């Protein structure tokens with residue numbers, strides 16, 4: 001929000017867990033203690049489109065994201081062209 | 082073994098799939114320290130293909146007891 | 147173009163990529179290394195070859211030009227590299243910046259993950275009515 005879908009979980013470990021999703025997610029930002037110690041929910045999200053490929057894999061244990069962003073550029077949908 | 086480590090625990094959060102149901106546990110945390118210890122485990126799966134999650138004693142309401 | 151002909155990533159024709167909206171706005175382009183002359187797969191449906199130069203193909207939009215990886219790393223190579231071209235220069239230094247390979251640690255940059263309160267009992271709906279004085283612009 002403008003890209004606000006929560007995939008968070010609690011492990012935020014990313015080995016045999018989740019990577020998939022065009023650019024958007026440059027994480028591994030180890031918070032001071034969370035097991036395989038890499039955490040949070042995103043990096044700078046003003047770049048790419050609206051997947052839920054975002055979970056599909058590696059837990060969000062609650063929801064999982066999808067489209068919810070509304071304010072929606074174009075670069076933010078393939079088609080501005 | 083002497084007190085109780087991981088021998089039967091309900092879940093109470095309301096987000097967690099098997100929430101009110103009580104399945105089995107495992108290597109619950111040792112140290113003073115963090116906030117998401119405890120593995121739990123039960124037969125029934127859930128919305129993901131793999132479901133074996135870690136909740137944490139602020140809560141586990143087990144409740145009686 | 148030709149009088150300046152600086153190419154690298156072989157192709158021939160195609161009604162696929164780049165068209166009007168990559169001048170009038172933004173541009174997007176990927177670059178890479180490679181060993182010896184090898185025939186690839188392509189975004190936009192087609193398919194060609196390699197060898198070198200910069201190995202610098204230009205691409206319509208950046209979801210398009212990382213898929214060289216989603217297969218173009220099932221075909222050897224550390225190094226593949228896409229930036230952002232404008233119609234004039236910079237800010238948005240795309241695969242530039244710091245480190246690379248989304249899954250390491252130097253800094254933390256953005257992200258956060260929480261909102262105000264965390265995933266916990268937001269059976270709590272939408273709170274205040276949206277009013278210019280209580281920290282809900284984030």
Ligand SMILES: CCCCCCCCCCCCO[C@H]1O[C@H](CO)[C@@H](O[C@H]2O[C@H](CO)[C@@H](O)[C@H](O)[C@H]2O)[C@H](O)[C@H]1O
Nearest residue numbers: 013014015016017028035036037038247248249250251
């Ligand atoms: C058993 C006979 C062999 C002698 C070795 C002794 C066994 C006990 C020590 C095991 C740990 C050694 O370190 C070892 O960590 C990982 C696998 O564990 C590997 O590293 C890998 O796993 C890391 C987690 O640790 C990941 O973040 C990395 O993506 C990956 O590089 C190391 O490349 C390896 O060197």
Ligand SMILES: CCCCCCCCCCCCO[C@H]1O[C@H](CO)[C@@H](O[C@H]2O[C@H](CO)[C@@H](O)[C@H](O)[C@H]2O)[C@H](O)[C@H]1O
Nearest residue numbers: 094116137138139140260261262263264265266267268
């Ligand atoms: C704190 C983490 C986020 C918010 C709650 C976290 C999840 C739920 C567990 C929190 C349980 C504790 O609830 C908490 O309510 C209020 C928030 O500090 C505190 O309420 C108190 O806050 C201060 C001292 O504590 C005093 O200045 C206040 O007069 C008093 O009302 C309670 O003393 C505390 O018990």
Ligand code: SF4
Nearest residue numbers: 009011012013058059
């Ligand atoms: S839950 Fe998803 S991406 Fe979130 S912390 Fe794990 S794998 Fe990382």
Ligand code: SF4
Nearest residue numbers: 021024049050051054
């Ligand atoms: S889930 Fe969202 S942020 Fe993640 S990759 Fe898909 S679109 Fe991007």
